[PDB]
Amino acid sequence: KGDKKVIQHLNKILGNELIAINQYFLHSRMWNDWGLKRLGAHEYHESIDEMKHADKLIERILFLEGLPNLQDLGKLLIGENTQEMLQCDLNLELKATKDLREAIVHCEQVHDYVSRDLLKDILESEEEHIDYLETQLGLIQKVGLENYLLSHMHE
**Smallest distance from ligand HEM to CB 108, Å:** 26
**Contact string (CB under 8 A) for a copy of itself, positions 102-141, x = contact:** --xx-----x-xx--x--x--xx--x--xx--xxx-xx--
By CB under 5 A, residue 117 contacts Fe ion = yes
Reported for 83-87, long-range contacts at CB under 8 A and 24+ positions apart, including other chains, are: 83/137, 83/140, 83/145, 85/27, 85/30, 85/31, 86/133, 86/136, 86/137, 86/140, 87/137
Of 32 and 87, CB closest to a copy of itself: 32
CA–CA gap between residue 113 and residue 74 (Å, rounded)? 28
Of 18 and 149, CB closest to ligand HEM: 18
**Smallest distance from Fe ion to CB 52, Å:** 8
Nearest to 13 by CA among 104, 99, 136: 99
The answer to whether 129 and 15 are in contact (CB under 8 A) is: no
**Smallest distance from a copy of itself to CB 10, Å:** 13
By CB under 8 A, residue 63 contacts a copy of itself = yes
By CB under 8 A, residue 101 contacts a copy of itself = yes
CA–CA gap between residue 118 and residue 107 (Å, rounded)? 10
Q: Which positions touch Fe ion (CB under 5 A)?
A: 17, 50, 53, 106, 117, 121, 126, 129
